[PDB]
Enzyme design. Structure first.
Site, PDB file in Angstrom:
ATOM      1  N   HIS A  41       0.716  -1.293  -0.046  1.00 38.72           N
ATOM      2  CA  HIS A  41       0.062  -0.025  -0.013  1.00 38.72           C
ATOM      3  C   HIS A  41       0.830   1.400   0.015  1.00 38.72           C
ATOM      4  CE1 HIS A  41      -0.245  -0.373   4.639  1.00 38.72           C
ATOM      5  NE2 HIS A  41       0.103   0.985   4.258  1.00 38.72           N
ATOM      6  N   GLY A 143       2.569   6.030  10.426  1.00 34.32           N
ATOM      7  CA  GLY A 143       3.617   6.154   9.943  1.00 34.32           C
ATOM      8  C   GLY A 143       4.481   4.704  10.706  1.00 34.32           C
ATOM      9  N   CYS A 145       3.261   1.733   9.781  1.00 36.69           N
ATOM     10  CA  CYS A 145       3.194   0.471   8.800  1.00 36.69           C
ATOM     11  C   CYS A 145       4.713  -0.157   8.276  1.00 36.69           C
ATOM     12  CB  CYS A 145       2.539   1.015   7.757  1.00 36.69           C
ATOM     13  SG  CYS A 145       0.776   1.479   8.036  1.00 36.69           S
TER      14      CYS A 145
HETATM   15  O1  LIG Z   1      -6.387   7.515   8.556  1.00 34.09           O
HETATM   16  C1  LIG Z   1      -6.575   6.089   8.455  1.00 34.09           C
HETATM   17  C2  LIG Z   1      -6.572   5.817   6.996  1.00 34.09           C
HETATM   18  N1  LIG Z   1      -6.034   4.370   6.871  1.00 34.09           N
HETATM   19  C3  LIG Z   1      -6.453   3.553   5.610  1.00 34.09           C
HETATM   20  C4  LIG Z   1      -5.757   2.262   5.388  1.00 34.09           C
HETATM   21  C5  LIG Z   1      -6.612   1.313   4.709  1.00 34.09           C
HETATM   22  C6  LIG Z   1      -5.788  -0.163   4.727  1.00 34.09           C
HETATM   23  C7  LIG Z   1      -4.722  -0.307   5.087  1.00 34.09           C
HETATM   24 CL1  LIG Z   1      -3.736  -1.689   4.698  1.00 34.09          CL
HETATM   25  C8  LIG Z   1      -3.884   0.750   5.827  1.00 34.09           C
HETATM   26  C9  LIG Z   1      -4.535   2.039   6.027  1.00 34.09           C
HETATM   27  C10 LIG Z   1      -3.819   3.054   7.145  1.00 34.09           C
HETATM   28  C11 LIG Z   1      -3.659   2.560   8.317  1.00 34.09           C
HETATM   29  O2  LIG Z   1      -4.324   1.706   8.927  1.00 34.09           O
HETATM   30  N2  LIG Z   1      -2.560   2.982   9.056  1.00 34.09           N
HETATM   31  C12 LIG Z   1      -2.478   2.769  10.429  1.00 34.09           C
HETATM   32  C13 LIG Z   1      -1.753   1.561  11.071  1.00 34.09           C
HETATM   33  N3  LIG Z   1      -1.647   1.479  12.359  1.00 34.09           N
HETATM   34  C14 LIG Z   1      -1.704   2.530  13.228  1.00 34.09           C
HETATM   35  C15 LIG Z   1      -2.403   3.832  12.840  1.00 34.09           C
HETATM   36  C16 LIG Z   1      -2.755   4.624  13.710  1.00 34.09           C
HETATM   37  C17 LIG Z   1      -3.308   5.834  13.274  1.00 34.09           C
HETATM   38  C18 LIG Z   1      -3.627   6.061  11.924  1.00 34.09           C
HETATM   39  C19 LIG Z   1      -3.094   5.076  10.991  1.00 34.09           C
HETATM   40  C20 LIG Z   1      -2.675   3.869  11.489  1.00 34.09           C
HETATM   41  C21 LIG Z   1      -4.473   4.715   7.010  1.00 34.09           C
HETATM   42  N4  LIG Z   1      -7.028   5.056   9.204  1.00 34.09           N
HETATM   43  C22 LIG Z   1      -6.749   5.392  10.803  1.00 34.09           C
HETATM   44  C23 LIG Z   1      -6.989   4.255  11.557  1.00 34.09           C
HETATM   45  C24 LIG Z   1      -7.024   4.229  13.157  1.00 34.09           C
HETATM   46  C25 LIG Z   1      -6.840   5.697  13.610  1.00 34.09           C
HETATM   47  S1  LIG Z   1      -6.523   5.927  15.228  1.00 34.09           S
HETATM   48  C26 LIG Z   1      -6.595   7.779  14.766  1.00 34.09           C
HETATM   49  N5  LIG Z   1      -6.686   8.083  13.746  1.00 34.09           N
HETATM   50  C27 LIG Z   1      -6.793   6.910  12.895  1.00 34.09           C
HETATM   51  C28 LIG Z   1      -6.897   6.817  11.425  1.00 34.09           C
END
Ligand SMILES: O=C(CN1Cc2ccc(Cl)cc2[C@H](C(=O)Nc2cncc3ccccc23)C1)Nc1ccc2scnc2c1
Ligand SMILES: O=C(CN1Cc2ccc(Cl)cc2[C@H](C(=O)Nc2cncc3ccccc23)C1)Nc1ccc2scnc2c1
Ligand SMILES: [Cl-]
Lengths: 305, 305
Positions: A41, A143, A145
């Protein structure tokens, strides 16, 4: 004496962490020999996440679109390929710090160490378990990932997990190092949720044995149970079924303490039915399920790496 | 999201661990530049431990009586001196893996990572805190003496603890890297016991702020308190007094969440009175005191949920 949630020493993995940037996305990569492994991704924007066609997004990319940074040095990408949900970037420099390693896929209930990374820089190390619902209760921010999970056996690092996403309940999902997800998850922005979780029974029993070894016996009783009767009460409390394999695996701890596995099962049954009554076990008011029988034997023996 | 007891990545410390042997005693040493630091009790037998005269035991030793092993290589000792309860062995090879470091003496309530070692080989890493009674609740077996406690801030390793002994209650005592013990302990086998321990109030408050940041507010109430009234109630539950310094230190977390320190103190007072009623806070059924305000700010997101 003492019992702590202990991680493996992380040094061998720290010397493999790099930063991978593609466009506006920056995440972590694992540099082993001349290949950098990272979540596929990294090639997606926010709009691509809804329904990404990874094989279509990847063809648009050239080697020079991937910026890899190892410490303060740029690595030159000379090739790229996809394997399941993992992107493999061939670089022009083999990692001189590459440890002896293997890629292994773990089962729910197994524990591993996570080296949480941001911008290719390790920030912390913690121990966790692959839950029966295939998620992990980790601690990750944006960040993180590409951060990896591992165990060490002798001088060999066994990589078992690569971080991909956080689910709505705050729990985490990822893949093995061959890009196969743990659990029914996909690497897209879609409606996804962790399934109902259960407690890892063999691990709670192992931790009860660790308490006995450390001088905590208040929960021990004169009773025993059958495996069938224990499983009827364990299912009632959302505990995973205990198999004859789990009983066999607990054999050594049963011999060191003199408490048969089904005798410890009778103690666990009473704890489930009556609670702790204001008491603690190894400093906890809950029954801990993130130590395997091997973890207990290793921490109560002093195995080094 | 998530909140875990997180240790610093241990690689920088792993490259400093060596084995020190004098006669029949073998323990761990810390190799920095051309000096190996280890507990002075490496020169003692079990008989010597009752009333050791370290100056008298040391004068009888020559450089060649100390065997230092770094990996599979013997280091040659070319000098020795005692500084408080630490023995400093000058070797003819500077450690090429010496990180940027400092020796720091910490105060009770402060946290650090421990790299548990046996025979100069690292076995595990875990997080802990200097208790108010100057002991640590570690996980150490025989042969762990000389294992070190540290923090890492911006690539600089700050060594704060060296392991010396286990007290009768299963807790651990040691020194800073200048050989000064934490607490009224001596490296002597005498009747010495850990004083009554207390809960680190400023850390429990920091952890309650970590729970609010991660989205949990069930424990708050409409009340506030004075610092004096809070301390009168806190001392009845064996909690350390909260000082104006602790209130000042909690300032940033109070501003990120919008909950005044004395308002959070009122919530803590009610939690002490009522218990959790089947609920958990950050996955724990007890009030956690081994995360400092600095640890919470380092691990948690800067955006409150
Ligand atoms: O902003 C997003 C979008 N995601 C879509 C998405 C879809 C599919 C895949 Cl494979 C990856 C992702 C990313 C994703 O999960 N990244 C992250 C991984 N581990 C911890 C994180 C902690 C905060 C943020 C991101 C995190 C990004 N989501 C989001 C989620 C969990 C919280 S807790 C606070 N804000 C968020 C915001
Ligand atoms: O046998 C001794 C004698 N000690 C006196 C003594 C007095 C002063 C000083 Cl500075 C050092 C020491 C040594 C000492 O504490 N060593 C150790 C250090 N960290 C963890 C240990 C875990 C198990 C064993 C030893 C350990 C040696 N104690 C003992 C204690 C705690 C348990 S728990 C089971 N056995 C023991 C046996
Ligand atoms: Cl301090």
């Amino acid at each position: 004496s003492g019992f702590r949630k202990m991680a493996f020493p992380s040094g061998k993995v720290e010397g493999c962490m790099v930063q991978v940037t593609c466009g506006t996305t920056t995440l972590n990569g694992l540099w082993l020999d001349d290949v950098v492994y990272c979540p596929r991704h990294v090639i997606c924007t926010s709009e691509d996440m809804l329904n990404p066609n990874y094989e279509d997004l990847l063809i648009r990319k050239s080697n020079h679109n991937f910026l890899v940074q190892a410490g303060n040095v740029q690595l030159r990408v000379i090739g790229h390929s996809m394997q399941n949900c993992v992107l493999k970037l061939k670089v022009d420099t083999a990692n001189p710090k590459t440890p002896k390693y293997k890629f292994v896929r773990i089962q729910p209930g197994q524990t591993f160490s996570v080296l949480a990374c941001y911008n290719g820089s390790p920030s912390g190390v913690y121990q966790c378990a692959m839950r029966p619902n295939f998620t992990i209760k980790g601690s990750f921010l944006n960040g993180s990932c590409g951060s990896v999970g591992f165990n060490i056996d002798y001088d060999c690092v066994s990589f078992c997990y690569m971080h991909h996403m956080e689910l709505p309940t705050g729990v985490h999902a990822g893949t093995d190092l061959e890009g196969n997800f743990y659990g029914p998850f996909v690497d897209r922005q879609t409606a996804q949720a962790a399934g109902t979780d259960t407690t890892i029974t063999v691990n709670v029993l192992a931790w009860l044995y660790a308490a006995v070894i450390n001088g905590d016996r208040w929960f021990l009783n004169r009773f025993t149970t059958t495996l069938n009767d224990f499983n009827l009460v364990a299912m009632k409390y959302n505990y995973e079924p205990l198999t004859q394999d789990h009983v066999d695996i607990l054999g050594p701890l049963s011999a060191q303490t003199g408490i048969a596995v089904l005798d410890m099962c009778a103690s666990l049954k009473e704890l489930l039915q009556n609670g702790m009554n204001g008491r603690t076990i190894l400093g906890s008011a809950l029954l801990e399920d993130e130590f395997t029988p091997f973890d207990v034997v290793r921490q109560c023996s002093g195995v080094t790496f």
